[PDB]
Amino acid sequence: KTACPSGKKAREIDESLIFYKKWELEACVDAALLATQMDRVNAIPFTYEQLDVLKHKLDELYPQGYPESVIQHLGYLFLKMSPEDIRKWNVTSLETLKALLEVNKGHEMSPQVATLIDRFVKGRGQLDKDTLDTLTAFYPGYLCSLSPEELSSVPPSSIWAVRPQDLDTCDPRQLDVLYPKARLAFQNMNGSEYFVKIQSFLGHHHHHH
């Protein structure tokens, strides 16, 4: 079937659409309307197949990848994305990253979230302070999951996002990379605070009994 029943053409994304059959959603809901009103989808308890119809509509409308104007409102529909879907995204806002990471809370990192994080950080050109705040907030061992080579390109400003417990899983090679960056970043600290906060970057426990 390829024709919307009379009077069923959707002019809004609203609760009435939950009663539509799958083919009715396909024939009656325009993809541009859906994309424009993604901020209303997650409050509407569509079934899995209904949401699959909507996701396919977005895929059809955006073969080159959803725009961030839609991504920022995907919500739990993020869990229906494939890694390939996410590789096309250009995500620049940290509010979008926080919104997407919130719906994955309580679970291990999936390939989808890994792709999302990797593409976001590469798009910013570096791991900046606020991004590291967010990533650590959702994944405490993110910083020390990076190799020394990866850590070497982290700007010292981002050290201000590094909390002492974040360094527990780091080894002396990673800490050899991070400690000089921390020396530079804490230039403007008061002496007492500097002495306290610098210690975790030395990882003394790795070197004595």
Residue numbers in the entry: 299 to 507
Paper text:
The tumor-associated antigen mesothelin is expressed at high levels on the cell surface of many human cancers, while its expression in normal tissues is limited. Here, we report the crystal structures of mesothelin that reveal a compact, right-handed solenoid consisting of 24 short helices and connecting loops. These helices form a nine-layered spiral coil that resembles ARM/HEAT family proteins.
Here, we report the crystal structures of a 207-residue MSLN fragment, of fl-MSLN alone and in complex with a therapeutic mAb MORAb-009, as well as the structure of its C-terminal shed-resistant peptide complexed with mAb 15B6. By truncation and alanine replacement mutagenesis, the CA-125 binding site was mapped to a 64-residue fragment at the N-terminus of MSLN.
